[PDB]
Every structure is written in C-alpha cells, then in structure tokens.
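Re-running the complex after MR caught last week's input typo. The corrected sequence lines follow. Everything else is unchanged.
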Amino acid sequence: ALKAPVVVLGAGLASVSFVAELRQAGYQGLITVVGDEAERPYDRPPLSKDFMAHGDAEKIRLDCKRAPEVEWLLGVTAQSFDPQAHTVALSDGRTLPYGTLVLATGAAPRALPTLQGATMPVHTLRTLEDARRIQAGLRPQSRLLIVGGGVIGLELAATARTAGVHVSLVERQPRLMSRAAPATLADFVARYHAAQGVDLRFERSVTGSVDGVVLLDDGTRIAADMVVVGIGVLANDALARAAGLACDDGIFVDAYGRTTCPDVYALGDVTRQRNPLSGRFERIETWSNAQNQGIAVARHLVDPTAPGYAELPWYWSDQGALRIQVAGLASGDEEIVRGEVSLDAPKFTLIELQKGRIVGATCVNNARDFAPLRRLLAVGAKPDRAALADPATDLRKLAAA
Amino acid sequence: ALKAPVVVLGAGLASVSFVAELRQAGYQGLITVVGDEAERPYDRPPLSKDFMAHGDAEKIRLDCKRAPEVEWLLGVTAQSFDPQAHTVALSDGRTLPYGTLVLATGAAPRALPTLQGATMPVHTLRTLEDARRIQAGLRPQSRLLIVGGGVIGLELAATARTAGVHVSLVERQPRLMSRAAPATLADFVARYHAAQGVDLRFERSVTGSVDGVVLLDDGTRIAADMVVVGIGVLANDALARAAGLACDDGIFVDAYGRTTCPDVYALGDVTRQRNPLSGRFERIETWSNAQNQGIAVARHLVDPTAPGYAELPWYWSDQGALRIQVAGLASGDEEIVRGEVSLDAPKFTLIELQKGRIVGATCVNNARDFAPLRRLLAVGAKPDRAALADPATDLRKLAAA
Ligand SMILES: Cc1cc2nc3c(=O)[nH]c(=O)nc-3n(C[C@H](O)[C@H](O)[C@H](O)COP(=O)(O)OP(=O)(O)OC[C@H]3O[C@@H](n4cnc5c(N)ncnc54)[C@H](O)[C@@H]3O)c2cc1C
Ligand SMILES: Cc1cc2nc3c(=O)[nH]c(=O)nc-3n(C[C@H](O)[C@H](O)[C@H](O)COP(=O)(O)OP(=O)(O)OC[C@H]3O[C@@H](n4cnc5c(N)ncnc54)[C@H](O)[C@@H]3O)c2cc1C
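Corrected-run output:
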C-alpha cells in the first residue's frame, strides 16, 4: 500500500506538508522530492503581500525540518512517469524508481489570449521570480493595469497603491472575487479599493493592446507601464494526462488522495476533489487545502485506519487595511450580518446559512470571531439566528457548547 | 491486474457488453453479474419506441450468448462492497468475493421536487416496469403531460400521439433537447411536434399540482390524466460513494475504466469520463457509450496492450416520422446545412465545424450520410466547405479518401 520508495513531484506547500507528515507519522523509507524551481521551498501568500513590499525571500521559506532525511532535487523537472515500470524521467537525464508516486505540481496562471502578442510588459504573479520581476517595475507614479478582480490581483492592487503606483483594474464579472466570496463582501471590497484610488472597471474585457495601451471591449483604452494578468490558474496536470490518469483541469482524487492509477496519488492545487459542503467536485486553490490535504493523505498512507481528508475549505486575503477571512460556502438561503459594514474602521462578520445551518462565514478585521465560526461550520451548527445577529453574543461560547 | 474472479454490478447493456467482450477476448475465469431487476437483460431504447407501441418484451432482450459461462443473479441488489476485503454484500444475504469489481449500475430518472406529494399519476420512464405502467395508461383521448423536452420525453410524445393520446409538454429551457443537440435541429423538432398536435410550453416550470391539475410558474394550469417526468437522470453511484471512490453524480473513470479504488472499474451511464472532442469530463447517457465503453474496458483488461476507450459520442432518437442521428459536438464556429429543412418529407444533414475541422454532425432521415460523417469526425477531417454544402458531393467518397 504505502510502498517505498516515495517520490513526490513538486516542492511547494502541499509537497512539504505531505513529506513532513510522512516522517512525523513514522514512515522511515526513502523520500525524494523533485522541484522544478531552483529555490529553497517557499510559501506563496507573501508574494502579493509583505514580500512584494519588503523583498526578503529569507522570510518566506517553508520549514523542512519536520521532514528529515528527504532528498530535494531542486531545479529539476519531471518530464514523464511510467506507471507500469514505476519510474519517473527527469530533465537532468536521471530516472527515479517509486513504490508510491505523489503528484503535487500545483497550478499556473492562465494566459490572456488577447495579450499574446503584446509589446509592453505583461506579467503573471505565481512564483518568487514573478514577484521579483513585478516589484522591479512598481516605480512610484507609474501606471499598473491589473486584469482580473480575484484576491491576488486585489492584494497586488493594495500593495501597489501603498507604494505610490497608480492602479487600474479590469474585471469581466460585475463584481470582484466572484469565486467563493459572498456578494456583501465583494461589494464592500470594491468600495474600499475605489476609496484608495483604484480605478475599477466592471463588466469589461481586454480585446488587445497596441504600443503600450490596452484595448477594452467597450471600445476604449487604458494606458499602462505594466499589465499584470490574474484571471485564475490552470492545474499542472500534464504528466498525469500523458500517463492516462483521469484529469480535467485538475487530477481527480478521492479523500485518500488516490488518482485513477494505482500507486499514484495527488494533492494540493493540482487536484480536483470533493468539497464536503457542496458535495461537488472542485479544484480548490487555497493554502489551507495544500497543507491540510497533504497532511491527511500522508497520515492515511502511513496509517490506513486514519480517516480520509475531511477539512472544510477556507482562505484569507490581506488587502491593505482589510484582513479578510472566508470559510465555507459564499452563499446559502440566508446571510446574517454582525456589526456594521463601513469604511470607517472596517470590522464585521457575515454568516451564511442553509435551512438554519451554518454553511459559510466571513470576518473582516476580526480574527477572534473566525475560529469559533469555523468550528460551528464544521459541525453544521444550527444556532439561534437572533443571537447570531445579537452583538451581545459570544461566538466562542456558542462553539464550546 | 485482470484478477479473477470478476464481479459486475448491474445487468444492463454496459454489463452485458463488458462480459461478452471478456469472453470473446479469451478470459476464462469466473464471471458473476448482479442485477437488481428481475428481468432477462434487456435494451432500453425500445421502451419509448416500438415497445411502448406493441408491448412484446421478448423483442427487446439483450443477447447474452457471446457471454457463455456467466452466472446472472437477477432480482438481487448489491448493498455494499468492501474494497479491502474484496467482497460484495448482496440483498439475499450472500457475499461474493472478487479479484476485479466492475460497477455498471447505470442511472435513474431525477424526481421533480414540486410533484413529490402529488395525488395524480406521476411516472418516470427508465425500466420495463415503468414502460408497462405508462402504456397501461395511454388510453386514446386521454391527456398526458410530459415534463422535460429531452429525447425520451419527445419519443414518448410521438408514441402517445400515434396512439391517440393528447399530449402537452413543459420545458424549462427555451428549446427542446438542450443537451447535445444543435439548435437548428431542436428548432425543427419543435415545429414537427407542434404540427403533430403536441402542446409545447417553453420557458415554463412546474410549481406543483392539485386534484389532477399541474401548476406552472406563469401562474397557469394544465389538466392531465397522467404526468411523465423526464428531466434527466442521476448516476447510480451510491455504492461507490459509500466505499470511498471519487464521484460527483457519476463515478470518475479514466480511459481504462479505472476508478480511484484499485481493482474497481466502472462503465456506462454510471460514469463521468473524458469526452475526447471537448476534452472535458462528462456523464455520457447513450446506448453507444454503454456498449463501446464496456467493450473497450473489457478488451484492455484482458489485453493491457490494447488502447483505452477512444470512441467519439453519438446517439439516435426515433420521434414519429423523424429518424434523428447526432454525433459529436452540438456546436462549433460553423454549421453547414445539407438539404432543405422542411416538414414536407423531412430529410437533411447538419455539419458542425471548428476552425474548418468537423466536430459534429446530424442526420434526419438520412442514415446513409451518417456513417461517412462519423468517420470524417473521427479523424478530425477538414474538408472543402462548399463541397460539404454542395449537394453534388458524395460523403462516402470523401470518407474513403
Ligand atoms: C501570489 C499568491 C498569493 C496567495 N495568497 C494566498 C493566501 O493569502 N491565502 C490562501 O489561502 N492561498 C493563497 N495563495 C494560494 C496558495 O499559495 C496555493 O494554494 C498553494 O501554493 C498550493 O500549493 P501546491 O503545493 O499545491 O502548489 P504549488 O505551490 O504551485 O507548488 C507546485 C510546485 O510544483 C512545481 N512543478 C510543476 N510541475 C513540475 C514538474 N513536472 N516537475 C517538477 N516540479 C513541478 C511547480 O512549479 C511548483 O513549484 C496564494 C498564491 C499566490 C501565487
Ligand atoms: C426509455 C429510454 C430510451 C432510450 N433511448 C435511447 C436511444 O434511442 N439511443 C441512445 O443512444 N440511448 C438511449 N437510451 C439510453 C440507454 O439506454 C442508456 O445509455 C443505457 O441503458 C445505459 O446502460 P447501462 O448498462 O450503463 O445502465 P442501465 O441500463 O441503467 O443498467 C444498469 C442496471 O444496474 C442496475 N443496478 C443499479 N444499482 C444496482 C445495484 N446496487 N445492484 C444491482 N443492480 C443495480 C440498474 O437497476 C440497472 O438494471 C434510452 C434510455 C431509456 C431509459
């Protein structure tokens, strides 16, 4: 079952979390990790946050010490694997044998087809190399155009504004954060960014560019010194597709991390997996999934009596003055608003319910509320809804009971 | 790999096709099939066609003779399987061991929530028992309401009209056959059914029923003696879900039929699988998939050097005077129309193209054209488009080259 040796493809958070848990759970056989980036394994959330602002990569490295006795092959690309021969072919000419193969190859930013032939700087933001490149161009008083109103684009928008960069942002949807964020939150976030000087353009798409100017589908133009594209990511599932695994913008896995190919597992951003709240398959794109799924899959490989992955989804986003936390589903049949929604010292909580049951929550500048809410969410709590609204209620108390 | 004994759950077309191919390919070990219906294995397409009209079940049985030495446990339900112990638990108290388990459990009609408490006859049409029940109520001059404008509902509509039954039909979409049928075809099919006296209601939904009358979301009413619901099907994937396989209204499989659980395969209507034309996962609901996927999975189990399943999708529908055949994708960036689209002796061909490449085709009352078109489709042919339109063109000739 858990057959030595273990080979992991990818050296990001999911991989690091997985191999650390293998060691902690007691597996003592060979572990080899293949990572295409020639970088000490590092975390991505700082790249649109404090790193973008302060530039010290030695503050963003992952801790690989709970993963002793691991050989990390950095700067090397896995080119294919043969699931019958149980081997992986590497770009440096070597071949690795495996008893258990783990695909943890993440996802890459989608390119914008209309900017393919652009003759102005166009970047995406995924890697440390990307961040360094973008930061090198965030000159004060320059003009940045961001395509996409997802959390990363908005984090970059805030960082750029703090650095004195003019920011315009184009979003095809009528709201920001259309993926997994309640409308109430998205509306407020737009007001916040607008108030900080971001030039927001909703229901607009990029049709092209000419000589340093981007063209939109309303027949208008936006001049910029740099474009950063952030319209989402695509799973890095090429090796899986070529080897005959079930994939569709993401490798399908069950709660044990199993792919359709025996002895091959997958975890993190590369997977398409069950969301336990919706009961539907989804490609989750969060830090917490990468870590939690990696840990759960490793734990069950070492101890098959352990449960499969069962964590509920959540993420956070740091956008200037807004410390945003979102858990569960973006909507149900009811939203309860705790506190006032205001640009004057923003601080509020949203709770999403379905037939009385909590299915999602949001905290803006209230980390203290978020932990109790995630606990209530996990057990599908059906609390008194006036109390949920009633500011006099302590959520931590509710959760303890 | 192909490990004896083989157990198949479900005794429909996919199962029969699979076990026949196992035998033909040379596998001589045990095969046991568990089928919940107490019926000699039978084909479903006649149920809304000639069977609905003539009632002889001995004309619709599947041929199990290319499947010698198979024990068919008819009238028995598989209640669970234990993929670690490699056993299946049966409703009759017995347990079957397996080396290879194959899930071929099909799909069941979706119920209409708004008719849950109905006090008038409400039926769905999937089984021989369903067909016999519906036919028993198709009294001449009675009123039938069909909910759903899919092919089965339309086949029943035509059959009922031929039998002198008044037919009304309610469809939530603005067109019939919204799944995998070109708009040009759907528009024509509506004209045909309207001309035959079907009372079609588009962009309407059922909100409820009271004392023999169905309520619609435009505030109106339709009286009927019987309702037949045909709004689609849901995969019978409960055993797979309970055992920890990856599922989402369908068991995920690769081109070898492998699920995420080692030694467990799935085929037919129960699977969610790659459509090679769209490159996306889809639950295919066709006779040709059930047979073709069953054969391909069996072939590769016996001979692992054989390719995985690779057939392109297609189906047919018999609706009164219309013999409809549809292959591939419903749309591309171009449609070519061969012949005139007319209610006077209907006979035409549609061809769908994407950047010059054939990606779909339709034939109405022209079986001769359909075979060559499927061949051109399979090789992604890029023929001269005037010739494709030019009535002087022989498609069979084009395909041979
Ligand atoms: C700028 C940014 C900000 C983010 N902010 C947040 C946040 O605040 N909160 C949050 O919840 N999430 C955030 N995320 C998301 C989060 O970081 C991801 O969910 C996480 O990185 C996924 O980890 P992973 O290990 O699955 O994939 P990855 O981090 O992508 O790691 C995969 C690695 O495998 C490599 N690889 C791919 N193919 C091969 C191959 N053939 N051979 C060898 N190596 C290969 C990749 O290049 C990559 O290094 C952010 C992401 C970015 C980019
Ligand atoms: C009325 C009708 C008309 C159709 N017309 C056409 C057509 O003209 N053209 C076309 O392309 N397709 C048509 N189809 C579709 C086609 O018949 C299906 O695609 C095909 O039946 C799928 O075969 P299957 O073996 O995968 O599933 P099924 O035929 O559903 O067989 C599965 C069997 O497994 C049984 N089962 C489920 N769970 C268990 C269990 N736990 N234990 C034991 N047994 C179980 C089921 O009850 C069922 O008997 C039609 C279908 C219907 C119903």
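None of the earlier attempt is carried over here. The longest helix of chain B spans residues 287-302. The interface with chain A takes residues 244-246, 248, 252-256, 258-262, 273-274, 279-281, 308 of chain B (CB under 8 Å).
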